[PDB]
Amino acid sequence: SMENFQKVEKIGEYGVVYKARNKLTGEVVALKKIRLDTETEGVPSTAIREISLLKELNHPNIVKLLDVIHTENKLYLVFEFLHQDLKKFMDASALTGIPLPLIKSYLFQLLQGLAFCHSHRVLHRDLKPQNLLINTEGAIKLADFGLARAFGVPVRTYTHEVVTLWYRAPEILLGCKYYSTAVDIWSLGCIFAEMVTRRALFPGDSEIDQLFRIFRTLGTVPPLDEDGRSLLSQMLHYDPNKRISAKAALAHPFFQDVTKPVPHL
Amino acid sequence: GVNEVPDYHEDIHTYLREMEVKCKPKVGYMKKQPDITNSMRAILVDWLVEVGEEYKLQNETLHLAVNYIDRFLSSMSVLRGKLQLVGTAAMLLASKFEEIYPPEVAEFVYITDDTYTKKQVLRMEHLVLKVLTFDLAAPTINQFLTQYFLHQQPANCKVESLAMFLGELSLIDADPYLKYLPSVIAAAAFHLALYTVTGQSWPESLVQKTGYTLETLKPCLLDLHQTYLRAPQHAQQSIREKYKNSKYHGVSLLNPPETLNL
Ligand SMILES: Cc1c(O)cccc1-c1nc2nc(N)nc(OCC3CCCCC3)c2[nH]1
Numbered sequence: 001s002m003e004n005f006q007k008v009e010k011i012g013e014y015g016v017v018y019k020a021r022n023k024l025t026g027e028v029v030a031l032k033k034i035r036l037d038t039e040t041e042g043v044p045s046t047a048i049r050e051i052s053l054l055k056e057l058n059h060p061n062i063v064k065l066l067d068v069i070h071t072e073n074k075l076y077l078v079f080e081f082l083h084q085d086l087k088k089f090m091d092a093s094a095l096t097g098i099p100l101p102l103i104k105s106y107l108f109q110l111l112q113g114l115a116f117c118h119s120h121r122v123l124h125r126d127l128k129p130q131n132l133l134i135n136t137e138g139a140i141k142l143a144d145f146g147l148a149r150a151f152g153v154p155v156r157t158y159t160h161e162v163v164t165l166w167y168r169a170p171e172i173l174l175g176c177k178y179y180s181t182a183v184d185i186w187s188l189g190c191i192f193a194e195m196v197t198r199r200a201l202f203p204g205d206s207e208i209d210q211l212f213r214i215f216r217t218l219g220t221v222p223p224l225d226e227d228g229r230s231l232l233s234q235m236l237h238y239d240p241n242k243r244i245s246a247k248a249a250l251a252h253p254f255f256q257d258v259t260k261p262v263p264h265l
Numbered sequence: 266g267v268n269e270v271p272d273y274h275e276d277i278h279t280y281l282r283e284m285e286v287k288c289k290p291k292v293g294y295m296k297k298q299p300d301i302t303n304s305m306r307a308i309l310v311d312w313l314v315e316v317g318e319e320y321k322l323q324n325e326t327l328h329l330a331v332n333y334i335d336r337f338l339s340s341m342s343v344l345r346g347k348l349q350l351v352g353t354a355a356m357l358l359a360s361k362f363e364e365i366y367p368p369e370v371a372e373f374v375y376i377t378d379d380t381y382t383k384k385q386v387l388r389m390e391h392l393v394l395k396v397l398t399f400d401l402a403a404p405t406i407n408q409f410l411t412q413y414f415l416h417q418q419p420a421n422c423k424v425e426s427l428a429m430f431l432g433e434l435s436l437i438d439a440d441p442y443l444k445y446l447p448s449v450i451a452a453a454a455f456h457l458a459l460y461t462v463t464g465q466s467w468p469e470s471l472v473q474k475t476g477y478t479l480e481t482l483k484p485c486l487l488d489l490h491q492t493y494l495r496a497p498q499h500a501q502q503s504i505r506e507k508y509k510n511s512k513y514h515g516v517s518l519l520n521p522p523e524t525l526n527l
């Protein structure tokens with residue numbers, strides 16, 4: 001079942017994520033192991049959503065689900081292996097910095113991935129650098145779809161406890177009845193700024209501190225050029241209705257000269 | 266506003282139109298089921314309506330459950346004594362997919378009052394997932410309706426509730442409604458609701474959006490109208506009961522139109 005996979009190392013995390021290799025093909029994969037609660041609650045809803053949504057989402061900037069291996073007691077999700085996450089990359093680059101062309105490339109690919117999600121009626125709802133994965137050839141991909149959800153048009157009220165605090169849009173913090181695709185754009189905006197400074201933009205300690213940080217910054221990123229700042233300002237618009245969509249962001253002048261450099265890995 | 270999601274609504278509509286075709290149950294699967302019938306399915310679906318009301322579940326959840334059941338029975342022979350098990354598991358799965366606060370498994374065992382163990386429910390959950398290959402994000406009548414509702418100017422609550430009522434009655438009767446796609450049932454329901462309440466017809470704007478006209482919709486519309494006219498006598502009555510509630514504007518109490526005019 002799993003007999004063709006050789007575990008190589010633990011990659012961290014519920015459930016447990018391992019790097020493994022397929023003994024017959026040579027392929028390196030990431031295996032996510034999910035305990036089934038066979039006498040109590042069954043398959044977790046987060047797994048049901050992650051799998052079902054990832055099966056629909058086929059795109060170069062969305063992590064590829066390769067297989068689902070069932071047992072009576074465990075589910076293993078077999079994913080393509082990517083070599084590290086954006087948070088680790090930023091930390092490694094804390095002193096050196098990240099070249100602009102790579103920042104631009106990564107942002108452009110994140111937006112392509114995200115626009116694909118939104119065009120397929122999927123909200124990610126947990127965009128943060130730990131959840132964005134990079135390879136040695138210059139790609140970046142959206143990962144960890146455990147908090148994702150398939151939405152309807154128009155949206156209904158969905159789960160409030162979404163998005164890690166630092167990346168959480170004001171409409172969520174303020175408990176608005178409805179939130180939509182704008183919440184993911186807010187997160188990407190935060191991430192854009194964080195690629196540039198290698199520091200979280202709004203590292204709040206509490207919901208109130210989070211809100212105060214947002215207000216005092218946007219009204220109640222030095223190295224960025226004019227086009228960059230224009231795009232960033234539109235990603236961080238307070239009004240969700242006015243916040244730029246991923247689709248429209250891909251046409252921003254910031255991206256006119258985008259390339260795909262390799263990371264300084 | 267962004268809630269109705271102007272940069273993506275056309276892409277989404279297109280995508281759902283593709284996926285309803287791929288998630289479509291097999292028409293007349295019941296003819297290949299030696300132990301169960303359309304009548305038994307109607308019983309089951311009517312009971313799921315009651316469940317959704319007891320637990321205050323979304324209508325979308327109900328619709329999903331039905332889709333899961335119909336696709337499951339399209340490939341798996343099921344004995345009558347187990348049909349409710351399949352249904353219970355489908356409703357659990359739909360709830361886990363769609364609800365912010367799904368009922369716990371124990372509530373689902375409790376509602377089958379004695380019949381099945383918890384173990385059986387959980388094992389069936391897993392089997393349903395395997396048979397559907399975790400392909401649970403199915404388009405429903407409701408997903409199309411809510412988009413169609415944005416073309417009203419202005420919105421009319423009785424129209425919306427009536428369209429939802431009609432779409433939900435369609436869930437009950439595999440014959441004829443399995444022949445029709447969710448987008449088509451939804452269009453017929455919206456037109457029939459709009460006509461019943463306001464005198465108006467399938468708007469041109471939705472002709473443009475969907476490619477459907479009253480001519481295209483005729484066969485479904487004819488079936489839905491008969492279903493609507495015969496609803497007070499149908500053996501299954503939970504949807505009617507449900508839609509007497511002020512939450513749904515009492516729409517099940519309205520008199521259906523005598524004729525459609527085409
Ligand atoms: C990050 C990392 C290293 O630092 C060193 C070696 C491998 C990885 C790493 N490669 C990964 N490849 C994939 N497909 N998924 C992962 O986690 C999915 C998670 C998304 C992030 C949250 C948990 C599940 C990975 N993590």
Ligand SMILES: [Mg+2]
Pocket residue numbers: 295296297298299300301302
């Ligand atoms: Mg039969």
Ligand SMILES: [Mg+2]
Pocket residue numbers: 442443444445446447450
């Ligand atoms: Mg049908």
